[PDB]
Amino acid sequence: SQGMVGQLAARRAAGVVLEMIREGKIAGRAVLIAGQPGTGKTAIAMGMAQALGPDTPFTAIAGSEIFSLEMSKTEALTQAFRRSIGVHTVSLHEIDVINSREIKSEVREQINAKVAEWREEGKAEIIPGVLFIDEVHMLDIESFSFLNRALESDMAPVLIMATNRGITRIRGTSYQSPHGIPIDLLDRLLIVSTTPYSEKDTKQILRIRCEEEDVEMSEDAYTVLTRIGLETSLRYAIQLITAASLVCRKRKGTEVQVDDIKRVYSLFLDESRSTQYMKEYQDAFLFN
Amino acid sequence: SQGMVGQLAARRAAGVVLEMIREGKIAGRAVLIAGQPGTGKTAIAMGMAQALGPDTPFTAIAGSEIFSLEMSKTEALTQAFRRSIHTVSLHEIDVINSREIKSEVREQINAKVAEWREEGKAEIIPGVLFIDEVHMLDIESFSFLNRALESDMAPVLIMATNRGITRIRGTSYQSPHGIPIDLLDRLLIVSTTPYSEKDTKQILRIRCEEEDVEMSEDAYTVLTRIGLETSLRYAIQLITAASLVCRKRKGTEVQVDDIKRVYSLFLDESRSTQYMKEYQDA
Amino acid sequence: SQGMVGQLAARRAAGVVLEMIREGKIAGRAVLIAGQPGTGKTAIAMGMAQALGPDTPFTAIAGSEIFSLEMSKTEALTQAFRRSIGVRISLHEIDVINSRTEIKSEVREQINAKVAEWREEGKAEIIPGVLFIDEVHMLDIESFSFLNRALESDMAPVLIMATNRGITRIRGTSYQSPHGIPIDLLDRLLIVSTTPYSEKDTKQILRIRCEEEDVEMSEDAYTVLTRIGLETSLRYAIQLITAASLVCRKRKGTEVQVDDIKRVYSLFLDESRSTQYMKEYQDAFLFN
Amino acid sequence: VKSTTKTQRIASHSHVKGLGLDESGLAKQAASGLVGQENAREACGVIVELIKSKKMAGRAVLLAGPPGTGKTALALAIAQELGSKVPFCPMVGSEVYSTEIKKTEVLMENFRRAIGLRIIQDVTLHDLDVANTEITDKLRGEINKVVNKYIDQGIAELVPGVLFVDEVHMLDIECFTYLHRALESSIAPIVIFASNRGNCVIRGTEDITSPHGIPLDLLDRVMIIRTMLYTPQEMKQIIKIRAQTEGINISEEALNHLGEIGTKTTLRYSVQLLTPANLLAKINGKDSIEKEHVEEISELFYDAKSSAKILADQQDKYMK
Amino acid sequence: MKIEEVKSTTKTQRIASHSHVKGLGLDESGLAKQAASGLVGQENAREACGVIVELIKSKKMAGRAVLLAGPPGTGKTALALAIAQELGSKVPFCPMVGSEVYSTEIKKTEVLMENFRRAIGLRIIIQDVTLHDLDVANTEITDKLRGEINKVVNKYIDQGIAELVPGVLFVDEVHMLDIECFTYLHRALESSIAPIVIFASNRGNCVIRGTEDITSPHGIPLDLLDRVMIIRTMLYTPQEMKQIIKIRAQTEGINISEEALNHLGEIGTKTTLRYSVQLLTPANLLAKINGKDSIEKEHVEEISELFYDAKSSAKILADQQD
Amino acid sequence: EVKSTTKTQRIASHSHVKGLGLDESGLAKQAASGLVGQENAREACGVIVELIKSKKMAGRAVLLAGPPGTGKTALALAIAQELGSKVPFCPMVGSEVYSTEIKKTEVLMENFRRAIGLRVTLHDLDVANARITDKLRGEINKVVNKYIDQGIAELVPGVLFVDEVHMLDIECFTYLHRALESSIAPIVIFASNRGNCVIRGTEDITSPHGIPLDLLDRVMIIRTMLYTPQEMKQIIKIRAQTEGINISEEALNHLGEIGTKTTLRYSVQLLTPANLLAKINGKDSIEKEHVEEISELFYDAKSSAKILADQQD
Numbered sequence A: 001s002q003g004m005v006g007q008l009a010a011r012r013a014a015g016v017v018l019e020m021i022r023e024g025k026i027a028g029r030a031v032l033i034a035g036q037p038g039t040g041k042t043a044i045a046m047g048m049a050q051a052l053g054p055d056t057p058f059t060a061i062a063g064s065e066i067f068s069l070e071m072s073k074t075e076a077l078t079q080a081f082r083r084s085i086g087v088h089t090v091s092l093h094e095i096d097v098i099n100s101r102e103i104k105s106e107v108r109e110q111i112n113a114k115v116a117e118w119r120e121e122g123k124a125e126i127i128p129g130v131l132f133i134d135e136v137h138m139l140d141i142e143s144f145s146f147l148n149r150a151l152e153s154d155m156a157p158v159l160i161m162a163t164n165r166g167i168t169r170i171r172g173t174s175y176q177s178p179h180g181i182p183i184d185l186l187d188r189l190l191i192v193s194t195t196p197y198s199e200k201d202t203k204q205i206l207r208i209r210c211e212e213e214d215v216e217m218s219e220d221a222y223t224v225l226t227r228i229g230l231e232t233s234l235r236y237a238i239q240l241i242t243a244a245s246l247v248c249r250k251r252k253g254t255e256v257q258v259d260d261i262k263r264v265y266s267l268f269l270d271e272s273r274s275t276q277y278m279k280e281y282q283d284a285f286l287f288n
Numbered sequence B: 001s002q003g004m005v006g007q008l009a010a011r012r013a014a015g016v017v018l019e020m021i022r023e024g025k026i027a028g029r030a031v032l033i034a035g036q037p038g039t040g041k042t043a044i045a046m047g048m049a050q051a052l053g054p055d056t057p058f059t060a061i062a063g064s065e066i067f068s069l070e071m072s073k074t075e076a077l078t079q080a081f082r083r084s085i086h087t088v089s090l091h092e093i094d095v096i097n098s099r100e101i102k103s104e105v106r107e108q109i110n111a112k113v114a115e116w117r118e119e120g121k122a123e124i125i126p127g128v129l130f131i132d133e134v135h136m137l138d139i140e141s142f143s144f145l146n147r148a149l150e151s152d153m154a155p156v157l158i159m160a161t162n163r164g165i166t167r168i169r170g171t172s173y174q175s176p177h178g179i180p181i182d183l184l185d186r187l188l189i190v191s192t193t194p195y196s197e198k199d200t201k202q203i204l205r206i207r208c209e210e211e212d213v214e215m216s217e218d219a220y221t222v223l224t225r226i227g228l229e230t231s232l233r234y235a236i237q238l239i240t241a242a243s244l245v246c247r248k249r250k251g252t253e254v255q256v257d258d259i260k261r262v263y264s265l266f267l268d269e270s271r272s273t274q275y276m277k278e279y280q281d282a
Numbered sequence C: 001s002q003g004m005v006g007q008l009a010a011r012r013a014a015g016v017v018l019e020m021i022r023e024g025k026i027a028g029r030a031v032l033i034a035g036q037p038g039t040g041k042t043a044i045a046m047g048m049a050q051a052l053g054p055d056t057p058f059t060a061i062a063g064s065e066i067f068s069l070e071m072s073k074t075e076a077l078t079q080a081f082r083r084s085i086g087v088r089i090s091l092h093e094i095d096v097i098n099s100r101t102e103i104k105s106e107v108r109e110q111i112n113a114k115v116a117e118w119r120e121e122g123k124a125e126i127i128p129g130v131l132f133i134d135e136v137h138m139l140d141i142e143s144f145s146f147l148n149r150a151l152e153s154d155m156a157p158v159l160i161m162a163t164n165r166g167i168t169r170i171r172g173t174s175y176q177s178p179h180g181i182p183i184d185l186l187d188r189l190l191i192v193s194t195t196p197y198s199e200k201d202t203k204q205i206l207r208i209r210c211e212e213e214d215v216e217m218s219e220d221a222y223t224v225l226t227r228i229g230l231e232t233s234l235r236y237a238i239q240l241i242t243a244a245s246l247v248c249r250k251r252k253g254t255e256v257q258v259d260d261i262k263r264v265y266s267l268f269l270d271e272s273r274s275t276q277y278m279k280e281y282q283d284a285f286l287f288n
Numbered sequence D: 001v002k003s004t005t006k007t008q009r010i011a012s013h014s015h016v017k018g019l020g021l022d023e024s025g026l027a028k029q030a031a032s033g034l035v036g037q038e039n040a041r042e043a044c045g046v047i048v049e050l051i052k053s054k055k056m057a058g059r060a061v062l063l064a065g066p067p068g069t070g071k072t073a074l075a076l077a078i079a080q081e082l083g084s085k086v087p088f089c090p091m092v093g094s095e096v097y098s099t100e101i102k103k104t105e106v107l108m109e110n111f112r113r114a115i116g117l118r119i120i121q122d123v124t125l126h127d128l129d130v131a132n133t134e135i136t137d138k139l140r141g142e143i144n145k146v147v148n149k150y151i152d153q154g155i156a157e158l159v160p161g162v163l164f165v166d167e168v169h170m171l172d173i174e175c176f177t178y179l180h181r182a183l184e185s186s187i188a189p190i191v192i193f194a195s196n197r198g199n200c201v202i203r204g205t206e207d208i209t210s211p212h213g214i215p216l217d218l219l220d221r222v223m224i225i226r227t228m229l230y231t232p233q234e235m236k237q238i239i240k241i242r243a244q245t246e247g248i249n250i251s252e253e254a255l256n257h258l259g260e261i262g263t264k265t266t267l268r269y270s271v272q273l274l275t276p277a278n279l280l281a282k283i284n285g286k287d288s289i290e291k292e293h294v295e296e297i298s299e300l301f302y303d304a305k306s307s308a309k310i311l312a313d314q315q316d317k318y319m320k
Numbered sequence E: 001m002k003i004e005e006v007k008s009t010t011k012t013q014r015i016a017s018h019s020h021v022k023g024l025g026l027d028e029s030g031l032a033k034q035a036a037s038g039l040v041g042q043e044n045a046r047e048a049c050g051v052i053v054e055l056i057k058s059k060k061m062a063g064r065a066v067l068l069a070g071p072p073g074t075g076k077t078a079l080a081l082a083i084a085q086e087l088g089s090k091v092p093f094c095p096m097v098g099s100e101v102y103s104t105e106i107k108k109t110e111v112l113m114e115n116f117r118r119a120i121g122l123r124i125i126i127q128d129v130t131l132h133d134l135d136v137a138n139t140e141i142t143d144k145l146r147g148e149i150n151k152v153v154n155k156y157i158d159q160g161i162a163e164l165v166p167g168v169l170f171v172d173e174v175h176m177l178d179i180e181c182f183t184y185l186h187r188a189l190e191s192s193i194a195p196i197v198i199f200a201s202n203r204g205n206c207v208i209r210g211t212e213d214i215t216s217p218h219g220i221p222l223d224l225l226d227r228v229m230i231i232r233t234m235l236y237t238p239q240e241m242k243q244i245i246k247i248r249a250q251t252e253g254i255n256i257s258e259e260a261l262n263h264l265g266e267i268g269t270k271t272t273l274r275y276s277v278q279l280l281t282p283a284n285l286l287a288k289i290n291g292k293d294s295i296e297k298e299h300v301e302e303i304s305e306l307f308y309d310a311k312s313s314a315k316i317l318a319d320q321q322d
Numbered sequence F: 001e002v003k004s005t006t007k008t009q010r011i012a013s014h015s016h017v018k019g020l021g022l023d024e025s026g027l028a029k030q031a032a033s034g035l036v037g038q039e040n041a042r043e044a045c046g047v048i049v050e051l052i053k054s055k056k057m058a059g060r061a062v063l064l065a066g067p068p069g070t071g072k073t074a075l076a077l078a079i080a081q082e083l084g085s086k087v088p089f090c091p092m093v094g095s096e097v098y099s100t101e102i103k104k105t106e107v108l109m110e111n112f113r114r115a116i117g118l119r120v121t122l123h124d125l126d127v128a129n130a131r132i133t134d135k136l137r138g139e140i141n142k143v144v145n146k147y148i149d150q151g152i153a154e155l156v157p158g159v160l161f162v163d164e165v166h167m168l169d170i171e172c173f174t175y176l177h178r179a180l181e182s183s184i185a186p187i188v189i190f191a192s193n194r195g196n197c198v199i200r201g202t203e204d205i206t207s208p209h210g211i212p213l214d215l216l217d218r219v220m221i222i223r224t225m226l227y228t229p230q231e232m233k234q235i236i237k238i239r240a241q242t243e244g245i246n247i248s249e250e251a252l253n254h255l256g257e258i259g260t261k262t263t264l265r266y267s268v269q270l271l272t273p274a275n276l277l278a279k280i281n282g283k284d285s286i287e288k289e290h291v292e293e294i295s296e297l298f299y300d301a302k303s304s305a306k307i308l309a310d311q312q313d
């Protein structure tokens, strides 16, 4: 249903989290979504945005997105929370570009007070959104400190963080913590675990994407491809499809045959074989 | 006597140093006092301040005190020497004429002082500076002292330390006491030895007197025994917390039972770490 | 002939490199003169300066001259290339003329554009020089990046680099390359290897240096002085002569004898014995 | 009054009203919310009487013990009983690292707030710092001269509060020196540190190893207190006290099963499964939380260590 | 915002070593030929690039990129050049090395934002022109000017007057770009005017530049490595390697005996193909000094004695030092 | 114009060094002009004195490698003695370059100017011509090249002693490499007691004595050897004489083993404090009793830290 396939564990757990959001009992927590890369961590976060409301704001910013020279880290994070709060309804960072034009920090606090008035007025009304920070172990203690100050606010959104890392050095210090998050915050997190896809789960996924890219396919070429997916990676299999049709439709086959999937699998490699060929050449060159 | 006890070696060695101070021969030297934490290094340094004169300026800055985000290191150290030299010191005069300090207002006061001093109106007397945990300082600050000791009005420097061979902070070389070798060839080094059992008892007997707290003879040998087992700093801590328990049950004066209770409640750094390294491994 | 002695391998290869300079085929390359210290790397480079021109500019700057207090690396390097570019009816020379105090990028493009006028004018003519950067492994990726932006130039001079190190971590990176040069540049270099001087080659050299201070010498002296030369360094033995004559002239001997060379060899040490003695003492107190 | 006191931090400590000691100074098994932990409870009782008897000149307090053993709770207890409306300021050590504000302004703002004046209007030194633009050190000395004057005039009394600095091993060598210098003054509050780490390299020196990550300059002015882990039988008693204060009905067996998670992970985790467990019961239309629920949450949500256990252990076989 | 087809910068030295590469030389259904349009061998990879040519024309390359992994001296700049040739009609090609972004006199974001604009051209009674030229015609580079020219250039296509020919951006030594450079690209590859990015790398599992615990394939981040299509290149056979050299000599006008390729080929098998190809010119000039038309095996054995490859020369100095 | 604020406090331990005590031949007398023993190195300095007088020291320096407390400064001070009357000598330690209130190039370029004098040092001509900056450096030198042209006043270059050379970073060496090229430079005498050291500021390059190879080549190295107990007593006997300290014959023997145990710098330092302790007991001279005590009271540096580490155990 709605593009979910399997992942019943996280889907259920995500369900529970909505209730503490609806019941107003989420204040001073967060959600962390732990699991291998490309196991629908984004989707489960996208899901909660949808199911929670018709106009709920949503923002998807990665960890490594903050290390850019565009502005400070604080400006980048501040702009994120400001965007992920809706008040037709338009977000607070949307309002900042009108009533400003960088932004003077005075402009922000200026708009804030005016908004507490119209909200209190009973003409304007506030709704929290959802912020999603992928790859969270990239952030550092100077940015984690900002979040705890940010969650303490009354109009704060719900924060959801994802990661695919176990015990790791907290970026910015010399200590190790689970998920590279400071321990002051991990005791407030609700951790939700996503497991890798099964065999049948994988097949269903490709079959959905083929529909999305209008590509005919044989049941043999469908299950020969799913086999690849479980052996290497799901984001590889999905890569091959569009490239597979263009070989089949080259010879005007139209319905993809196993020959093409055997062929195009031999032409574009995946990151595993790419390294191992490099690694082999590296060491034989180091030989003598 | 300044209620000195024990330290028979360092006390005498300190005595010899006063003569080269009085004979005008301490110029181009300094005093280093090596020894374990809590063996009267500040006291022995406080002693020489006393015996050298009734009004000698004395200054206590620790080594790590220079790491201030308020001021740079040079102000931190300059304000030390200026502070350590009716009668008043330069740094106290520095704030009046500087009604942070302007760099010109110091050199200004120096010229004005060279007149009144050479005049025969005022007299300058050097004091004593004490820099505890000197290994914290770095080569950027050691360079300053050597330039600072060259002045005619400079005080005598007394540096304490409880470390052996150590990396000179700011470089990649290991030097004794973390001091550069250009400076150790000028220092007079004095070693302070740990206290015996008898020496310990007399110390704790004085501080109970200092705070108006009685004790039984058993308590002293117990409390002194704790002193030798853990640290004199810890034992001296237990007393005030000891009296408040003895006075709790309306006892007159502290007994062994109360040293028992106040012991099992408050802990020292040795037991505190082991009763937590057991959890750390697990 | 012409002062060069031995180095018969590099002398010939240096000869070929002139031809790619004369035939206009050096563009987009450079010369690296690899070889242990004190094997005439500067000489063979200076030979190309002599052999190529009557007025050819020449600059001898080490790598460590770039790490200076009173200018950026770009400033110091840029002034080198400016100076080593000849012009007559060098660019850095004119820059104190058409400027007056500092030189600016806008000032430079001015004189460069004006020079594009007088060159094609037919009246003024430009001729490239030779830049010699000894101790090249000192440079970093910020300086190598500048060279690749420099050698592409239309009046760029020929770059000659020296070095006495094998693999090195490129200063500025976490990566190791042969000769401490980035791999993007080493595929554009012509490498010449210089071999250490033979015995007869050494003796001939000293005989030239002695002549320069009108210092006369006995035959056994040369034979003994060469032995120290091959044993320690050509750059050491040449140091002893000047000092040697002053002992001979001290006893009005008129001509250096082995007693003097045996004497002054006993008074002034060399870097080998110097360290050994330090390292012997360095250990004993360290033992305790 | 600026009414800026935080509440979402102390939310997990609403039940703690006192230290629960008899007149003599021996702990009762449970009173004023606290349960067990008698040794530390008795020790805090002594610390209470040195603060009132003015014997705590300069000294601080350290609560060394494993996480989830009542460190913050004991600190909060002392403040309420010691005086009416005495301020409590919890802070984690990692709050000093912020880009938009200097370290000194982080420590001082909490330090000033922990102190209040009883004129009658009770207000914290920090409200007078925001009542009297930007607040610099010149402004603080002035208020202390105008506040030390009011109390001396009988008009108001100074009630010093509690400053709880959790994760002390994260404050660098510069923050401590800023504390040590302030801890000697007379208007400061009582500083209570807390640590669950043994000997650690003092943040900012890369060579010094001192206990708990504190300098020896300041470590000789601290009174250490240990806390021991809670027993399975005490563990179940604490959670029942939180389930009540939340107005949550829990089954007797499930209170046992939730207690064992306490022994497995931490007391802070087991308590945090109450709320989500309750909502899962509302989904199935129940009043109380039955064992099915707690067995359900305990398989949906994960404690921190086990999750990284899964991923890292999957990571050896995931990549080769 | 004037159009300047004439005003341009072309690095002669970079095209010169691939002057012979005219087309990917694919025919039929993309089947490779042993020798076609200058290329030789590399049949596996040549066939694949033929597919990428189609994905680009059929507009399927939605935010994808290309990675050519393989040992150095295997035809990786050549193939990426041919793809630019095969898209046809003088599409831009901007070869750059990863280590160029570290420059002191210019920010990293400018060095990349620049090289992209050189690779997207606009064929607009008509004269082609690159987006960078419309910036230089637009002495200040601003983030406002960017979107303006993106609206001005894309208002012309949207008027139907203008057609956009996006070219190829070849970034070699990709493992030398730090994170901030990859995240700059990562948004630029999202745009609709962007060119094709063709990365290239010969290292293996490389840690991202900076103090990063992450170990990533080819030193690329994981977020960007997902939008990459990897193609492998294989080492050249002695026999193929000769047929490469014979083509460079023909393009330089150099007459060389058979035994001179048989020997010059083997040195390629030992060191690289880039080293062997470089020896042609210096061999020829020495062949002129001895007054011969063609290069005899004596000249290759001679140059081989004078000039060294970096991988051996450094080996000598370290060991003779030791 | 001159306050002459020269480091007298620094040279106070060298008052007895009058010259190199050279003999008529290249050999020098076993004991003369204050110095004692260390003959081999003394003779070499005799050669360095000639190359300076014969103007052959163009570009070169001197390196005095040897263990600590073997008479490095004393020779370097003596060399300034032999080069005429009242020639500048500016002893500086290498770690003085690291300063907060001053650029490294200042305090180096400054000591260099303090050491070249006229007939009045070139550093005096910057405070006297002060706005001392690099613009004014290039001006008074040519403004003084003119005076030698006129013969009004003659330039005598002095000696510069840079101790602890291994503490100067790669930037300082490149600076001296420049100014040692100019024609108004003094004789730079480095001193080091360490073998191969990573050149400060490079973290990978190892060179002899911590000196870069470009500068390590224009250097003439001279080794000094440790003193015998025999000779070491004579030096301590010489310092006592110059300080008016009567010392017992037995004490010099007990004060000569303590030297060879630790250093010569240490034993010379124990004289003054030993004397005052004898004044306490109202003695004319220093008896063995005293040195038996000061050896107990004060400690040499390495032994003190030796004790504290063992107390760490």
Ligand SMILES: Nc1ncnc2c1ncn2[C@@H]1O[C@H](COP(=O)(O)OP(=O)(O)O)[C@@H](O)[C@H]1O
Binding pocket: D012, D013, D033, D034, D035, D036, D037, D066, D067, D068, D069, D070, D071, D072, D073, D074, D238, D241, D242, D267, D268, D271
């Ligand atoms: N002695 C106690 N009696 C009852 N509840 C307690 C006691 N100590 C702690 N708690 C509660 O247990 C939970 C976790 O303990 P907490 O004090 O927060 O851990 P930490 O030890 O790291 O500070 C909180 O709900 C807290 O209020």
Ligand SMILES: Nc1ncnc2c1ncn2[C@@H]1O[C@H](COP(=O)(O)OP(=O)(O)O)[C@@H](O)[C@H]1O
Binding pocket: E017, E018, E021, E038, E039, E040, E041, E042, E071, E072, E073, E074, E075, E076, E077, E078, E079, E244, E273, E274, E277
């Ligand atoms: N298949 C080929 N066809 C034609 N020329 C080739 C072929 N393979 C390599 N070359 C030539 O070899 C040289 C190296 O190009 P390339 O291999 O891309 O450099 P790199 O190997 O470092 O990527 C160029 O001359 C290129 O044209």
Ligand SMILES: Nc1ncnc2c1ncn2[C@@H]1O[C@H](COP(=O)(O)OP(=O)(O)O)[C@@H](O)[C@H]1O
Binding pocket: F013, F014, F034, F035, F036, F037, F038, F068, F069, F070, F071, F072, F073, F074, F075, F163, F235, F238, F264, F265, F268
């Ligand atoms: N040859 C000598 N004869 C007499 N006294 C000497 C001699 N050499 C050094 N001294 C004295 O011994 C001490 C050693 O100083 P010195 O070792 O020269 O400096 P450094 O330790 O830096 O090398 C000084 O008091 C010096 O004057």
